[PDB]
Amino acid sequence: CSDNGDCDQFCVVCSCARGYTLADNGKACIPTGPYPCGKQTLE
Amino acid sequence: IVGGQECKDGECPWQALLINEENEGFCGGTILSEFYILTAAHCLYQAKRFKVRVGDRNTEQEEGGEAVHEVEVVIKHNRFTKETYDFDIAVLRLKTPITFRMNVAPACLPERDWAESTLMTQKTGIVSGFGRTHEKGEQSTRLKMLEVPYVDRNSCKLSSSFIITQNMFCAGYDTKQEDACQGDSGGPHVTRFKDTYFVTGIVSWGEGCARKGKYGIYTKVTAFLKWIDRSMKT
Numbered sequence: 033c034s035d036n037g038d039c040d041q042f043c044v045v046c047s048c049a050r051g052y053t054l055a056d057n058g059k060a061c062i063p064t065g066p067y068p069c070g071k072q073t074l075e
Numbered sequence: 076i077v078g079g080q081e082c083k084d085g086e087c088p089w090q091a092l093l094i095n096e097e098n099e100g101f102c103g104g105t106i107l108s109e110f111y112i113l114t115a116a117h118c119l120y121q122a123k124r125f126k127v128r129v130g131d132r133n134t135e136q137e138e139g140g141e142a143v144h145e146v147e148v149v150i151k152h153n154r155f156t157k158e159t160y161d162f163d164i165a166v167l168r169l170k171t172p173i174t175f176r177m178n179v180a181p182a183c184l185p186e187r188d189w190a191e192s193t194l195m196t197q198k199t200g201i202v203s204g205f206g207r208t209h210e211k212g213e214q215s216t217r218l219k220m221l222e223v224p225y226v227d228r229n230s231c232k233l234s235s236s237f238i239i240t241q242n243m244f245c246a247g248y249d250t251k252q253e254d255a256c257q258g259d260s261g262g263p264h265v266t267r268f269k270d271t272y273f274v275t276g277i278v279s280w281g282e283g284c285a286r287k288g289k290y291g292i293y294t295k296v297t298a299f300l301k302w303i304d305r306s307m308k309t
């Protein structure tokens with residue numbers, strides 16, 4: 033795999049952590065809720 | 076945390092605080108999901124009865140978002156021993172689920188092989204907690220964070236009075252007066268990959284805090300990803 037095989041998260045075949053889905057590009061990760069794992073929170 | 080800075084609002088949302096019957100913080104934790112907290116097995120020896128506080132940034136002010144959870148199940152690694160401090164990991168199942176909100180959200184668990192090659196090879200991680208602000212001093216009433224460089228395993232073994240195992244890793248500074256300290260114990264060590272934070276360590280031990288020629292020792296979460304998965308499923 034690794035420029036991380038262009039993946040936003042896991043790995044050319046990408047995958048994401050629970051609470052995200054792999055985008056149409058197949059390289060990006062999209063949150064499924066307002067508080068996905070590993071993202072700092074904003075008001 | 077010795078050195079570093081206070082966490083701004085929403086900056087360290089996976090921080091949990093273990094509180095004893097005095098309503099005092101004695102260890103940290105990492106929120107893994109609505110029901111699970113990751114902590115250090117050694118933290119379980121400090122207080123027979125404890126609870127978990129989420130959403131707190133200032134222990135002297137009761138502010139919006141703070142919530143207390145009782146622990147239903149303690150899952151301590153069966154190989155943990157104070158003789159070596161090896162296998163310093165425990166997972167807590169909460170009685171009620173955490174509601175994710177501002178200052179309250181989980182850190183990501185990475186896939187093992189990817190984490191070994193891609194996260195553990197980054198320059199730095201972030202450690203956070205309410206621990207001592209100096210080796211001899213008091214615990215911080217404010218949640219602090221600190222960027223810590225990953226330290227070569229062999230340089231760490233040379234620096235250490237005690238055995239560094241493969242279930243541990245070293246991070247911090249040789250002489251710069253910045254490190255985690257007692258009370259941050261059990262708390263998160265996270266590594267950023269692109270724009271996401273993955274839990275990589277558990278604050279475990281150190282010879283004093285920020286001592287010249289000494290590093291911070293963390294439980295290596297990649298070594299326990301299968302163990303954590305099984306514990307969260309039991």
Ligand SMILES: O=C(Nc1ccc(Cl)cn1)[C@H]1CN(CC(F)F)C[C@@H]1C(=O)Nc1ccc(-n2ccccc2=O)cc1F
Nearest residue numbers: 158159160210237255256257279280281282283284291292
């Ligand atoms: O918590 C600490 N430091 C610290 C600094 C950085 C990070 Cl990341 C975490 N912890 C120190 C400071 N504290 C004093 C004051 F700051 F509160 C006592 C504590 C200690 O001696 N621990 C300690 C030392 C050694 C061992 N140890 C290691 C291997 C085998 C046996 C063994 O006992 C276990 C410990 F918990």
Ligand SMILES: [Ca+2]
Nearest residue numbers: 133136137138
């Ligand atoms: Ca508070």
Ligand code: NA
Nearest residue numbers: 248249286289
């Ligand atoms: Na040092």
